Ligand binder design. Structure first.
Ligand SMILES: Nc1ccn([C@@H]2O[C@H](CO)[C@@H](O)[C@H]2O)c(=O)n1
Ligand SMILES: Nc1ccn([C@@H]2O[C@H](CO)[C@@H](O)[C@H]2O)c(=O)n1
Ligand SMILES: Nc1ccn([C@@H]2O[C@H](CO)[C@@H](O)[C@H]2O)c(=O)n1
Ligand SMILES: OCc1ccccc1-c1cccs1
Ligand SMILES: [Cl-]
Ligand SMILES: [K+]
Ligand SMILES: [Zn+2]
Ligand SMILES: [Zn+2]
Ligand SMILES: [Zn+2]
Lengths: 159, 159, 153
């Protein structure tokens, strides 16, 4: 079978005055991620991994910060559109795995919520979607709570 | 043909007065990795990739870091238990790849032994396990030798 | 059948007096990447993902004195084939605050596809800034990440 792998990366700054939205989940916190709309670092990484697996460029090439069509779209809408494009390219999604690196707050309570959102948007069984969380052991801008990173891996198959 | 992919990340601080244990190998060195377990950054990354590929969460979910057994835990025993759970979930491991990023010490003399340990723990032949090493080209906290990072990828198949 | 995955990481410092070469594309810029070779961070990450997927070690284990990174990528492909593997696809991300990489990405894909003897639609290259965070965000270096899938025939 015609399997393909994709990989994704994203990072945003963490500062007072924005809400924290990760994997479609709003998470209580003094601070939030700085970005164009919701700055959903996990959904962006996943979107990138899916475009990558399909060899369709990247998230910024499909959904520009300038495009009127996506001006007020949230990252779940973008993820859904991504999934439609991957489908039309001939690919079925097999699984997604991911890691959020955040020194704080605790993400574990929210993991099943994120998985549920992602599986819904990709039309995948829940057991094909995984999200993991790591601290940076107090190293670097991640370790000082200055930003949050997401990594993603996706496997697809041409059908 | 039900393939799944997983990815993992880990980093630990490098501090005096600790054994340096990476990939299960005790490496002569004046500093070691800081953590509650033996802090084996490579094995944790691989363990997370395997749980990720099976959609079984992450290492914190499976091995509570406040269990007395976690203190000084042999990360190879953790990796073997991870493999047991992944098998119990119905998955067979096809391959593992990984990268260690460290300014020092020189890892090359130890890499084959790490490979052999991981292959043993996962009941894989050597030719399905790979460990790569990198410096960070003098950049950042890794370039300053403040910690060591590992990255891992795993492919599994649900039987 | 007998599929394998690999993953690769590279980073190089940005320094004056060097051309900036990424994915085989020379990009106008005041600085370039520092390395023994031409320091093509993207090609190095893909090279390591390919050796990793074939369980052949890493780029430092294999590597030529004045060779550029495309010759090394071609040699990597040769060694991957020698071990009995065929390449199925490559995906990657370049993390650079500057310069703008958009105009150059399709050319990088074409270069990699030619070097790996792959059709264009099995090769992908993505780009990201680091949101002004860390050494990447300060423009002190450029990182690349890669993933490769191969099959043992
Ligand atoms: N140094 C960089 C970094 C990113 N990019 C492109 O910008 C869009 C948003 O990340 C993406 O489409 C990405 O390709 C770029 O052209 N140059
Ligand atoms: N921001 C974070 C970071 C980590 N975690 C969980 O804590 C375990 C060890 O860091 C991790 O393995 C993960 O289980 C979390 O819930 N939220
Ligand atoms: N701390 C490190 C980092 C890297 N290396 C080896 O040097 C070569 C160049 O990355 C690679 O072959 C790598 O294995 C090492 O021996 N120890
Ligand atoms: O059961 C796996 C295991 C093997 C060896 C040592 C500790 C454990 C832990 C159990 C819970 C936290 S660590
Ligand atoms: Cl270094
Ligand atoms: K990183
Ligand atoms: Zn983003
Ligand atoms: Zn660890
Ligand atoms: Zn390099």
């Amino acid at each position: 079978m015609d399997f393909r792998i994709g990989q994704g990366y994203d990072v945003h700054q963490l500062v007072p005055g924005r809400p924290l939205i990760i994997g479609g989940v709003t998470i209580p916190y003094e601070r939030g991620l700085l970005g164009h709309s919701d700055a959903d670092v996990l959904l962006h990484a996943i979107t990138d991994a899916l475009f990558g697996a399909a060899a369709l460029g990247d998230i910024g090439r499909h959904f520009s910060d300038t495009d009127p069509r996506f001006k007020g779209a949230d990252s779940r809408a973008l993820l859904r559109e991504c999934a439609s494009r991957v489908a039309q390219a001939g690919f079925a999604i097999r699984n997604v795995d991911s890691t959020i690196i955040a020194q704080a707050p605790k993400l574990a309570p929210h993991i099943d919520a994120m998985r549920a959102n992602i599986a819904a948007d990709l039309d995948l069984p829940l057991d094909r979607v995984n999200v993991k969380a790591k601290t940076n052991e107090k190293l670097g801008y991640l370790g000082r709570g200055e930003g949050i990173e997401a990594q993603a891996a996706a496997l697809v198959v041409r059908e």
